[PDB]
């Protein structure tokens, strides 16, 4: 019953996009991606699910596995660069930055393709069934933030001040009526006694 | 949690923040004007126009649908007309709701931008928590905000 503005509608679109990306990431953990490094020798992944995956999806999976394997040594270096590690090699830092940027590009491409292929996300969910409880909590918090922000942007700024100016009176009268009903219920109880 | 997964989550959050920044930059030049509100009004009016066109086509068919064997077709057209009329009434309700409770376009846009800034700050806070792996703090903040916001307009039928 509350309409939304163009800016608020764009915010909602980005909200759904972020939720979809988070859900996709839920089934794109590091271990499964690394399991895609060697299709033939890594038998932990069933052949049928790999075959059911699209050629572009499989290519993205292999590329992401390779990028993650390469960047594993440099992830800690990137994390600790913010600390006192002044003696970090310049070439090592440049290589780590390049690997991170390539990994980000590949992950964005994979997310874009998955959002464009329902079968891709369905298969991804099929391969992995154990979802981190922290991941579920983050997804639910994302939905809660989405709903609260829809609530905020579904309200006129004049109505926003209404929550303080006129909705103050509305809520106070709601409390008054609730307490009046409480008093009438107490009267009913006393009369029955 | 794995550092690769945390980095990917941070990248996704920063991508969402960058999308918000691009939207704000596009709105910078003149999108603050009523052109966006006018565009939404025009899209709603185009939906209303489509409903009216379908209703008029059905009415024309009914007027020209003179025939005994087609009574079932006439009934179907009447049902479609009823659905179109209900859609038109609902669209009129929505458009009037737009026109009544949004008298101040400037204030509404200002509040939308403030909400956007608040959400970008919240996203950066979430990114910092993930880098610190403090998912519990993020969940607590979400719970607190959920508890805080609570209600609006529900008060109408609540009073009823």
Cα distance between the two ends of chain A: 45
Among residues A73, A68, A65, which one has the least CA distance to residue A44? A65
Q: Which of residues 66-105 of B touch A (CB under 8 A)?
A: 94, 97-98, 101-104
CB-based contact A9 B40, cutoff 8 Å:
yes
CB-based contact A156 B104, cutoff 8 Å:
yes
Among residues A127, A27, A147, which one has the least CA distance to residue B8? A27
Please tell me the distance from the alpha carbon of residue B24 to that of residue B18, in angstroms, as a whole number. 10
Which residues of chain A neighbour B12 with C-beta distances below 8 Å?
Answer: 18, 21-22, 25, 111
B115 near A152, Cβ under 8 Å?
yes
CB-based contact A157 B108, cutoff 8 Å:
yes
Q: Is B37 at the interface with chain A, CB within 8 A?
A: yes
A16 near A161, Cβ under 8 Å?
no
Method: cryo-EM
Nearest CA in chain A to B139: A141
Which residues of chain B neighbour A134 with C-beta distances below 8 Å?
Answer: 1, 135
How many distinct helices (H) and strands (E) make up chain A?
9, 0
3-state SS of chain B is: CCHHHHHHHHHHHHHHHHHHHHHHHHHHHHHCCCHHHHHHHHHHHHHHHHHHHHHHHHHHHHHHCCCCCCHHHHHHHHHHHHHHHHHHHHHHHHHHHHHHHCCCHHHHHHHHHHHHHHHHHHHHHHHHHHHHCCHHHHHHHHHHHHHHHCCCCHHHHHHC
- Distance from the A144 Cα atom to the nearest Cα atom in chain B, whole angstroms: 7
b/e string for B139-152 if b means 16 or more Cβ within 10 A? bebbeeeeeeeeeb
A70 near A140, Cβ under 8 Å?
no
Please tell me the distance from the alpha carbon of residue B1 to that of residue A176, in angstroms, as a whole number. 50
b/e string for B16-36 if b means 16 or more Cβ within 10 A? bbebbeebbeebeeebeeeeb
Q: Token pair 């997964």 is at which residue?
A: B5
Among residues B137, B16, B5, B116, which one has the least CA distance to residue A137? B137
Q: Which of B152, B157, B159 to mutate to test the interface with A (most CBs of A within 10 A)?
A: B152
CB-based contact A156 B113, cutoff 8 Å:
no
Q: Is B9 at the interface with chain A, CB within 8 A?
A: yes
CB-based contact B145 A148, cutoff 8 Å:
yes
Please tell me the distance from the alpha carbon of residue A11 to that of residue A17, in angstroms, as a whole number. 10
| Cβ count within 10 A of residue B58 | 21
B135 near A134, Cβ under 8 Å?
yes
A155, A168, B106, B100: CA torsion to nearest 10: 60
B39 near B98, Cβ under 8 Å?
no
Q: Token pair 């390539």 is at which residue?
A: A102
B7, A149, A16, A29: CA torsion to nearest 10: 30
CB-based contact A6 B108, cutoff 8 Å:
no
Please tell me the distance from the alpha carbon of residue B130 to that of residue B112, in angstroms, as a whole number. 27
CB-based contact B107 A163, cutoff 8 Å:
no
Longest dimension (CA), chain B: 76
Residue B5 makes CB contacts below 8 A (sequence gap 6+) with A25, A29, A30
Q: Identify the burial level of A151 via C-beta atoms within 10 angstroms of its C-beta, where 0-12 means exposed, 13-18 middle and 19 or more buried.
A: middle
Among residues B8, B155, B101, B97, which one has the least CA distance to residue A156? B101
Residue A46 makes CB contacts below 8 A (sequence gap 6+) with none
A61 near A50, Cβ under 8 Å?
no
Q: CA-based Rg of chain A, rounded to a whole angstrom?
A: 26
Please tell me the distance from the alpha carbon of residue A187 to that of residue B74, in angstroms, as a whole number. 60
The minimal CB distance from B139 to the residues A2, A141, A153 is found for A141
Please tell me the distance from the alpha carbon of residue A115 to that of residue A13, in angstroms, as a whole number. 13
Cα atoms found within 13 Å of the Cα of residue B66, Cβ hemisphere only: 2
Please tell me the distance from the alpha carbon of residue A128 to that of residue A36, in angstroms, as a whole number. 13
Q: Is B7 at the interface with chain A, CB within 8 A?
A: yes
3-state secondary structure of A86: coil
Which H or E run contains A62?
helix A55-80
B41 near A9, Cβ under 8 Å?
no
Please tell me the distance from the alpha carbon of residue A124 to that of residue A127, in angstroms, as a whole number. 5
- Distance from the A145 Cα atom to the nearest Cα atom in chain B, whole angstroms: 7
Sign, Cα dihedral of A7, A13, A19, A24: negative
Please tell me the distance from the alpha carbon of residue A162 to that of residue A166, in angstroms, as a whole number. 5
């Amino acid at each position: 019953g509350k309409p939304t503005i163009v800016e608020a509608q764009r915010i909602l679109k980005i909200i759904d996009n972020l939720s979809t990306n988070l859900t996709i990431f839920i089934y794109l953990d590091s271990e499964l991606i690394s399991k895609f490094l060697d299709v033939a020798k890594h038998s932990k992944l069933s052949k049928d699910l790999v075959s059911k995956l699209s050629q572009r999806c499989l290519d993205l999976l292999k590329s992401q596995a390779e990028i993650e394997a390469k960047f594993k040594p440099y992830a800690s270096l990137l994390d600790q660069s913010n600390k006192e590690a002044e003696d970090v090699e310049e070439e090592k830092m440049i290589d780590a930055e390049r690997l991170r940027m390539q990994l980000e590009n590949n992950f964005k491409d994979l997310v874009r393709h998955l959002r464009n292929s329902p079968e891709d996300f369905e298969i991804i969910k099929s391969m992995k069934t154990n979802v981190n409880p922290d991941l579920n909590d983050l997804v639910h918090c994302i939905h809660c933030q989405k709903v609260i922000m829809l609530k905020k942007l579904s309200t006129a700024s004049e109505e926003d001040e209404n929550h303080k100016a006129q909705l103050r009176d509305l809520e106070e009268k709601i409390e008054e009526l609730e307490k009046k009903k409480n008093k009438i219920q107490e009267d009913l109880t006393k009369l029955k006694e | 949690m794995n550092q690769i997964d945390a980095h990917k989550l941070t990248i996704i959050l920063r991508d969402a923040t960058e999308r918000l920044t691009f939207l704000d930059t596009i709105n910078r030049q003149d999108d603050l004007s009523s052109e966006l509100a006018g565009y939404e009004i025009s899209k709603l009016l185009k939906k209303q126009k489509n409903l009216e066109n379908q209703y008029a086509d059905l009415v024309q068919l009914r007027t020209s649908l003179t025939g005994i064997q087609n009574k079932k077709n006439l009934i179907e057209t009447q049902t479609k007309i009823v659905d179109v009329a209900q859609n038109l009434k609902e669209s009129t309700k929505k458009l009037c709701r737009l026109f009544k409770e949004n008298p101040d376009l400037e204030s509404d846009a200002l509040k939308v931008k403030k909400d956007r800034i608040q959400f970008m700050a919240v996203i950066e806070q979430l990114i910092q928590m993930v880098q610190n792996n403090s998912l519990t703090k993020f969940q607590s903040m979400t719970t607190l905000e959920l508890e805080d916001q609570d209600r609006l307009r529900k008060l109408i039928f609540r009073e009823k």
